[PDB]
Amino acid sequence: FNIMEVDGVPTLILSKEWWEKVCNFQAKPDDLILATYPKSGTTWMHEILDMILNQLIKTHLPSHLIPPSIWKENCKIVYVARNPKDCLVSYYHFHRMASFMPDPQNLEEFYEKFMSGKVVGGSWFDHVKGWWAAKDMHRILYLFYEDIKKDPKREIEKILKFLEKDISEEILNKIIYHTSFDVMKQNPMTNYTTLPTSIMDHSISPFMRKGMPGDWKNYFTVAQNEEFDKDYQKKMAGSTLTFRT
Amino acid sequence: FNIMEVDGVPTLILSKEWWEKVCNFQAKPDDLILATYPKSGTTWMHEILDMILNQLIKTHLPSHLIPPSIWKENCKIVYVARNPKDCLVSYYHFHRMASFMPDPQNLEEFYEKFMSGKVVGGSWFDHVKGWWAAKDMHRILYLFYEDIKKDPKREIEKILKFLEKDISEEILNKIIYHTSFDVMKQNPMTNYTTLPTSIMDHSISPFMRKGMPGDWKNYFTVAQNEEFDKDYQKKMAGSTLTFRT
Ligand SMILES: Nc1ncnc2c1ncn2[C@@H]1O[C@H](COP(=O)(O)O)[C@@H](OP(=O)(O)O)[C@H]1O
Ligand SMILES: Nc1ncnc2c1ncn2[C@@H]1O[C@H](COP(=O)(O)O)[C@@H](OP(=O)(O)O)[C@H]1O
């Protein structure tokens, strides 16, 4: 059914049990929360932050489960959304490689489940929409996986403004260079290669898979797609939320 | 390489050898030529004519190989085109069942070949374009597989006008009913079931496969498709030729 991915080393926590543990989490103002739907840019965005700095709390929770401490102590929250199609496809190939995960079966089979939101991490729909609703009320930066690919400088530009932090021009690119998909894929300290293949086999699918927006186009039949649109446009009626693909 | 499909019982004739044999074919005016690219509505259109009447010459030849006799004797030529995507998909699943045919291999592999026109029956592109250029110079009725599905009455309406022939309203629908895909599929006299499975196995793919326009959408990845369009738009620059899909 429905749990959530966590990381002492990647594993499944029952959302509730996990929420009970975090329920009354206390937050120092300097703390920096980073939230994302799974396979929506996390490991990437993280290393972008970790770069900018060198306390970062990584959380795949929906907005309505963030410990109030954070709201109260107006913590800086970076949030990253990624278009659903790509997020779906990335998340699919993931189930198809991570042993921790349930069997994805067919790609048509997975879809039905994904749109129903009946997959590890809740509904991507409910997830992204909550956060967007929150960007109105909180110290949240809302970023889009695609816009980063589009303009890494133009994006990190923003992050800095948000953090009051101010880097070099060389130190700047030093970051951009590393947080390119090419460099990061060949990087054992992020690429999750240095892992049990019983846990994650890259010979099936590598965590750092393709990392191109628009890749979904390589898997979604013109039918499955025109299906995805109709179902999407429904769940997103009213939303001011908008994606490049 | 490149031959053509014929029918004492369906078989491969080397296009040239076959054209040499037909080169100086003599044509009585009353004769009715029906031409089509393969898997573009032939067996359907045939039975429509056979119906309307009960001499019909069935030919899968390109316009520039029709024996001049026919031109000279201004014969009535019904021509049927079917949109390429569908035509491709239909023709693909066909190779994948008809033993007479070469191996289609992958569906991506087949595509390359189809667009290159390097498949049994020549280039669908060169085929339909020639016939369209001819509709300007000859007693040719140019029909579209899709328009038929769209409005069989509204289509057969035309055929009659073209033939001067004039049927009943009941005799009319009697025809429409039979030349529906549903009726025809369960019909041994057209459905090619009554055949050697060494020649054609329906347990793989039935000649009367789906018979819905828009079916291709069930096979062509949003990439393969956006690929097909770009390549198509090229070969069809200038053409006034146009398809529903
Ligand atoms: N530096 C980078 N630039 C672009 N995409 C990256 C990246 N690092 C990781 N990704 C992509 O992030 C996705 C996993 O997201 P998360 O970090 O949220 O689990 C993968 O998508 P693909 O599966 O499309 O390749 C991966 O390729
Ligand atoms: N009465 C009918 N109405 C619609 N389509 C028909 C039909 N009879 C045959 N077809 C379709 O004609 C195609 C074969 O064409 P041809 O007669 O030129 O070989 C098949 O397409 P599919 O493979 O898309 O099902 C078949 O389904």
Author numbering:
A (entry chain A), B (entry chain B): 18 to 71, 112 to 302
Article, verbatim:
The crystal structures of SULT1C3 bound to PAP, apo SULT1C2, a ternary complex of SULT1C2 bound to PAP, and the environmental toxin, pentachlorophenol (PCP), and SULT4A1 were solved at 3.2, 2.0, 1.8, and 2.2 Å, respectively.
Substrates for SULT1C3 have not been reported previously. Our data indicate that this recently identified member of the hSULT family is able to sulfonate p-nitrophenol, 1-naphthol, 2-ethylphenol, 2-n-propylphenol, and 2-sec-butylphenol, as well as the steroid-related compounds, α-zearalenol and lithocholic acid. These data suggest SULT1C3 may contribute to the metabolism of steroid and phenolic compounds. We have identified a number of novel substrates, inhibitors, and compounds that bind to these SULTs in the absence of PAP. However, a closer inspection of the structures also suggests that binding of substrates may not be completely uncoupled from binding of the cofactor.
